[PDB]
């Protein structure tokens, strides 16, 4: 079964998306400000289990619109 | 911009291939250009190594380069080519047109 | 330098994957870095689209970018990972180590 | 059957190589001087048939060391 998720990423063809789980990915490159991506996830569920680092944080959930307005924090 | 399929028309005359490619004069080969910034989107079917390599590039750019946008499935085209001066019809000229891009 | 396989050790702790990867602490994932300058060498198994795209990049860099160095065959590794707190043994974790590079 | 060819390219693990045909490829990028590559060829024989352009010239032969000290010219 799938779930509807908030889509706020460059690969979003609409405000919502349907996937196996909802994702919030907080990514920080070496130079610029961290960007917060929201969307769904169907492959590589193991990304959700990664401990937050200084550069990446993976949040995942499978409730309806559970990834909406969820703020993540990176490691120092 | 992000990794996606870009239109790219190849004129066989302007690459010297019209000497043996009788027809067509050209074709839409397309092109996969764009950056593979993390997270690697699923529609680009990123492999686990590409995802890992993208994570190390975030840690520091010196150790690992960023995942690259490359064609993942290629489609054949039909050409008319000279076979020892003889115009022959090849139905599937494999690996010519891009149908799917990805991050590898 | 040219497209070739470069050693790249991944420390699972430094990418946050040690939370679920019990063993090994890391592995040699390798990396395909280097430029795919024309002519594209045959040991990098370049496709016909990659060869064509490399030819248009020579005509003018604005129309088509250069072919990219990416992994072409990936090898699995064996890991010990937590399955709901249980240390389980996965024999083939596919798509983790680079065995062959190429230009696509 | 294969043939021995002069190898003078960045991908040469020795002075000679064995392939179906010998190659001399004269490549010119947009900025720097044209480089002359010598080696063998087993795939994409159709590259040999390409008419010389302002940026690339493909020479091919299948004699013993036939691609040795062969000078190519590009188009204006
Ligand atoms: Ni998992
Ligand atoms: Ni695409
Ligand atoms: Ni062209
Ligand atoms: Ni990035
Ligand atoms: Ni994979
Ligand atoms: Ni290699
Ligand atoms: Ni690392
Ligand atoms: Ni080049
Ligand atoms: Ni091909
Ligand atoms: Ni041919």
Residue numbers in the entry:
A (entry chain A), D (entry chain A): 30 to 105
B (entry chain B), C (entry chain B): 321 to 424
In the authors' words:
As expected, the ALK1 ECD binds BMP10 in a 2:2 stoichiometry, and the two ALK1 ECD monomers are not in direct contact. Using the PDBePISA server, a total of 26 BMP10 residues were identified at the ALK1 binding interface (lines over the sequence). Secondly, by solving the crystal structure of the BMP10:ALK1 complex and comparing it to published structures, we have identified three regions that are highly conserved between BMP9 and BMP10. The conserved region 1 accounts for ALK1 specificity. The most striking feature in the conserved region 2 is the insertion of a hydrophobic residue, Y416 in BMP9 and F411 in BMP10 (red arrow), located in the top strand of finger 1 (red arrows). This additional residue leads to a kink in this β-strand of BMP9 and BMP10, resulting in a novel conformation that allows BMP9 and BMP10 to form unique interactions.
Bone morphogenetic proteins (BMPs) are dimeric transforming growth factor β (TGFβ) family cytokines, initiating cellular signalling by forming a complex with two copies of type I receptors and two copies of type II receptors, both of which are type I transmembrane proteins with an intracellular serine/threonine kinase domain. Activin receptor-like kinase 1 (ALK1) is a type I receptor specifically expressed on endothelial cells, mediating the signals from BMP9 and BMP10 exclusively. ALK1-mediated endothelial BMP9 and BMP10 signalling plays many important roles in angiogenesis and the maintenance of vascular quiescence. All TGFβ family ligands are synthesised as preproproteins, processed by furin-like proprotein convertase upon secretion. It has been shown for several family members, including TGFβ, BMP9 and BMP10, that the prodomain remains tightly bound to the growth factor (GF) domain in circulation.
